[PDB]
Homo-oligomer: A and B are copies of this chain.
């Protein structure tokens, strides 16, 4: 029975605490936050064994097998390292690190300490994204993939820390692009990136990028687009399309739930937009891949089943983003090494 600690009792600590509490092979043992009242509230809401106010004590406790780190991006590296050095398995929310060297250091650490290190690429475990991938891999029907495009857009993160470079490590390219890049590479069966090209925008007034376009060229000829935004009103969008020589596949997460509703006022449990025509969500957590993700991690820890989607995939995506940031700066298409293609 895998004894789990949640580190950061905010929004994603809550999502993970829910899926942990529901999983028969695990126990929600502890919740820790710098804000001890936020840890207590979440420990209560999901019936955790306890609130643990001390990081040091949490790490020394031999009753904890796995920590889930849901703190602000810029803390991920230090927290995960300390955790792995203390002997704990770790699931870290994306971004696993804020630079490829941060990520590489964690992977090497996890290997040295013989620990499972997993990162929070949940969409890659979304049942509807899994399906879409089988369809593209059905060569008879789809043929050879030549385009993949993944779009993540919303009206921007609300938490104050996501506005500072030291706490967030980057703007929209890092926050949403990490996911878009992973989904492109993974929809094409782990395709190798040969070049990266990107351009960033600052749409909101005075500074982190709040919208970006990043494009990858892959070994086989295919081209991937990642189009991400913190400045799109009207409801979060997560879509993908893949186009091959013979077929097409389209995926829609938030307006492909098969529910529509209309009201003047606004429905009680309905997000944003509030009023008028909306697309209410059912089982958003599962549809988004969190149950399957966390389940994989609980199994990897509980019985050394290797992860299907490892942290090496986080290194590859970190390299892509870092190169995207450079491509924007230099206004050219770059190899992952940083060299210009020409």
What is the 8 Å Cβ interface bit string for chain A, positions 243-285, against chain B (1 contact, 0 not)? 1111111111101111111111111111001011110111100
If the complex has contacts A146-B211, A199-B215, A268-B141, are A253 and B246 also in contact, measured as CB distance less than 8 A?
Answer: no
6 new A-B contacts, CB < 8 A, other than A249-B260, A331-B333, are A203-B221, A249-B262, A257-B258, A258-B258, A275-B275, A332-B340
The answer to whether A199 and B197 have CB atoms under 8 Å apart is yes
Interface residue? A206 (CB, 8 A): no
A273 cross-chain contacts in B, Cβ below 8 A: 262, 264, 276-277
The total of chain A residues at the interface (CB under 8 A) is 80
A252 cross-chain contacts in B, Cβ below 8 A: 258-259
Binding site for B on A (CB under 8 A): 24, 127-128, 130-132, 134-135, 138, 140-142, 146-147, 149, 153, 195, 197, 199, 201-204, 211, 213, 215, 217, 221, 223, 225, 227, 229, 231-235, 243-253, 255-270, 273, 275-278, 280-283, 330-333, 340-342
The answer to whether B263 and A246 have CB atoms under 8 Å apart is yes
A243 cross-chain contacts in B, Cβ below 8 A: 153, 229, 231-232
A197 cross-chain contacts in B, Cβ below 8 A: 197, 199, 331
The answer to whether B249 and A259 have CB atoms under 8 Å apart is yes
The answer to whether B278 and A277 have CB atoms under 8 Å apart is yes
With beta carbons under 8 angstroms apart, the residue of B142, B255, B267 that contacts A135 is B267
The answer to whether A146 and B249 have CB atoms under 8 Å apart is no
The answer to whether B268 and A138 have CB atoms under 8 Å apart is yes
